[PDB]
Design a protein around this ligand. Structure first.
Ligand SMILES: [C]C1=C([C])[C]=C2C(=[C]1)N([C][C]([O])[C]([O])[C]([O])[C]OP([O])(=O)OP([O])(=O)O[C][C]1O[C](N3[C]=NC4=C3N=[C]N=C4[N])[C]([O])[C]1[O])C1=NC(=O)[N]C(=O)C1=N2[C]([C][C]=O)C1=C(O[C]C2=C(F)N=[C][C]=[C]2)C(F)=[C]C(F)=[C]1
Length: 647
């Protein structure tokens, strides 16, 4: 349905109040049920009005005007609901035409560190709420871990580049507002072995289905058997994977043993049986000789010796009958061996390709992920097909930047917060002699976790952060993932496939250039560097890594089919001081709860909060994503406005 659809699109149950709404509307939860149903219709219809046309601000007046009777009659309640939705960024978020121009007198000074999606989303909220917002951004550009390369006809994203399902996804709103050109991804993904030979379909399917099996098995180990701590250490996904593969190999070796025992037993029965038939031939040779030696006792001696001879001959023909049913059991046993090994060398390499795919998805080696919690956010996936931003994901943050007071090339070095306000200190990256001091009432820190982890610190906090926050920083994972962009003047690959795989030759290097993407109008290929390879490869010059790309591609399509690229780009997210990695992951020994601790504001001791946190690493249910970063900016904007303008 329509207004039910709007609730779903807002990640809300269409037919009950959230706890958050119960808090803000206690008169509703404690009042009659009829009024609670009225409340929910107001909420859903208001969201529909916004979502049907997110390019313009949805005001209270226009909501009241578009409500049908009797709902447009409870004016006070309509306003209460509108105000709540707006404050929490469920309407009038993103970029839209303001009907009410911005208030000319501001209220409170907020410094936002970082002009990524989380910083931009919060800034637009706080500016709409009437506050004085200034963003300090170290790079010469907005977008942070959204980073679009453009040169000639080439456009390619070096950071984020995929919108997961639009159903429930706030990026669906931003897409409509900004005009992102999105394009659904075709799912076919052929694999090529390291010699460039295609992986046959049967081997592709066999290994993939086994991959699914192994992983489901780790999840049974974890969440049914509670195999989560071992020898006083938290178990990693990689560790569990090594364990379940070891058990499959044990099982294979056992069925092999059982089968060899069956072989041996059959051979032994034949040896014995042949010895017995041997002696029975010898016994018949003796009776057959006493049959030619042959009176009344002679006429009866032949009858008796024929009775004896042909009785031994029946013993012998019946034993050659067993001889046949046995060497017939033997022949098919030698012809039906169970698998010699669990994974052929090629089978193992292909399986390592699927592992690399998972290390791509989590941006970190599997041996680092928490076995128990690495996919704790699975239950929050959006519905619908995934898409890529054909026109470059920077269109989103660039659009969000319009009208904001953003100081680029401005690197924060120190953040001071007291019960009397805050001071942020920064340097000009083009002239690190030039220094700036920003006084403010509140700081919103959207520095990446990688920057927060940096030792010695890039940014110094005064007073230092509390142990519960720094130890959460210490526990959490911050991964890495890199891309090689190859721009050609001609298309030599299969244009109808968005993906194809290169099966690495070894486990340790399974993530090197393992997956190629074909996603754009023009001839562009992205090659991914995942897992252990991701950090190590940053130490390779551009030209050499491109050469390795080209060698792979020449192996797949032929040496003369692959021309020299006209333009190349190589991400190095770990070495980037403004990222120091790509995005968080749930490290073994961490959990979603660390994401909640990351979101928690700091209050200087006896008082009111001064230092706030946003970014993909602060949102438990949507970490490591653009929409999660976005939502986190909206969340903190609500928290800060509640503090400085009143709930
Ligand atoms: C890196 C990366 C990559 C490479 C990729 C990707 C990513 C990443 N992702 C993630 C995102 O992006 C995130 O989450 C966001 O971005 C966040 O944001 P924030 O929070 O805001 O942060 P930033 O941005 O960084 O910001 C901050 C700021 O700050 C600053 N600074 C620093 N330092 C300093 C400063 N300032 C001042 N001072 C100082 N000192 C900086 O600069 C900044 O600005 C993503 N996401 C999403 O959503 N999507 C996508 O797509 C993405 N990605 C990926 C990964 C994984 O896997 C993904 C995917 O994949 C896709 C693909 C690719 F990429 N390629 C090819 C093919 C495919 C998927 F599918 C999904 C997902 F989910 C993800």
């Amino acid at each position: 349905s329509g207004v039910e659809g709007a609730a779903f699109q807002s990640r809300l149950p269409h037919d009950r109040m959230t706890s958050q709404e119960a808090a803000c509307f206690p008169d509703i939860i404690s009042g009659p049920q009829q009024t609670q149903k009225v409340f929910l219709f107001i909420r859903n219809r208001t969201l529909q009005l916004w979502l049907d046309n997110p390019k313009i601000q949805l005001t209270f007046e226009a909501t009241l005007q578009q409500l049908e009777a009797p709902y447009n009659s409870d004016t006070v309640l309509v306003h209460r609901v509108h105000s709540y939705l707006e404050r929490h960024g469920l309407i009038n978020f993103g970029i839209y035409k303001r009907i009410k121009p911005l208030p000319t007198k501001k209220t409170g000074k907020v410094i936002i560190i970082g002009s990524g999606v989380s910083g931009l989303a919060a800034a637009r909220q706080l500016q709409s709420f009437g506050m004085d917002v200034t963003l300090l951004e170290a790079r010469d550009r907005v977008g942070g871990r959204v980073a679009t390369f453009r040169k000639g006809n080439y456009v390619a994203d070096l950071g984020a580049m995929v919108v997961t399902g639009l159903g429930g996804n706030p990026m669906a709103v931003v897409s409509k507002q900004v005009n992102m050109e999105l394009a659904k991804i075709k799912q076919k993904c052929p694999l090529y072995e390291a010699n460039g030979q295609a992986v046959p379909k049967e081997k592709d399917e066999m290994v993939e289905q086994e991959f699914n099996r192994l992983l489901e098995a780790t999840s049974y180990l974890s969440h049914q058997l509670d195999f989560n701590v071992l020898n006083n250490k938290p178990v990693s996904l990689g560790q569990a994977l090594e364990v379940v593969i070891q058990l499959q190999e044990k099982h294979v070796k056992d069925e092999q043993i059982e089968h060899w025992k069956k072989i041996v037993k059959t051979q032994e029965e034949l040896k014995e049986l042949l010895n017995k038939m041997v002696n029975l031939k010898e016994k018949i040779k003796e009776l057959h000789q006493q049959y030619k030696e042959a009176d009344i006792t002679a006429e009866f001696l032949v009858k008796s010796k024929h009775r004896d001879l042909t009785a031994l001959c029946k013993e012998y023909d019946e034993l050659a009958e067993t001889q046949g049913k046995l060497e017939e059991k033997l022949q098919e046993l030698e012809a039906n061996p169970p698998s010699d090994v669990y994974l052929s060398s090629r089978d193992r390499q292909i399986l390592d390709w699927h592992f690399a795919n998972l290390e791509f998805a989590n941006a970190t080696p599997l041996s680092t992920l928490s076995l128990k919690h690495w996919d704790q956010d699975d239950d929050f996936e959006f519905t619908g097909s995934h898409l890529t931003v054909r026109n470059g994901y920077s269109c989103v943050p660039v659009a969000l930047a319009e009208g904001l007071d953003i100081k680029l090339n401005t690197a924060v070095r120190q953040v001071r917060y007291t019960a009397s306000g805050c001071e942020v200190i920064a340097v000009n990256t083009r002239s690190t002699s030039q220094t700036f001091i920003y006084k403010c009432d509140a700081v919103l820190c959207t520095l990446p976790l990688g920057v927060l982890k940096q030792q010695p610190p890039a940014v110094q906090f005064v007073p230092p952060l509390p142990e519960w926050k720094t130890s959460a920083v210490q526990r959490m994972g911050f991964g890495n993932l890199n891309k090689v962009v190859l721009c050609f003047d001609r298309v030599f690959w299969d244009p109808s496939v968005n993906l194809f795989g290169h099966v690495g030759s070894t486990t340790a290097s399974r993530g090197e250039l393992f997956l190629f993407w074909n996603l754009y109008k023009a001839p562009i290929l992205l090659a991914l560097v995942a897992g252990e390879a991701a950090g190590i490869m940053e130490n390779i010059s551009d030209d050499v890594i491109v050469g390795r790309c080209l060698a792979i591609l020449k192996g797949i399509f032929g040496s003369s089919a692959v021309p020299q690229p006209k333009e190349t780009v190589v991400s190095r997210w770990r070495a980037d001081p403004w990222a120091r990695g790509s995005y968080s992951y749930v490290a073994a020994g961490s959990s979603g709860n660390d994401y909640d601790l990351m979101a928690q504001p700091i209050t200087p001791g006896p008082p009111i909060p001064r230092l706030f946190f946003a970014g993909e690493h602060t949102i438990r249910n949507y970490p490591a994503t653009v929409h999660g970063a976005l939502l986190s900016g909206l969340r903190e904007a609500g928290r800060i406005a509640d503090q400085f303008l009143g709930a």
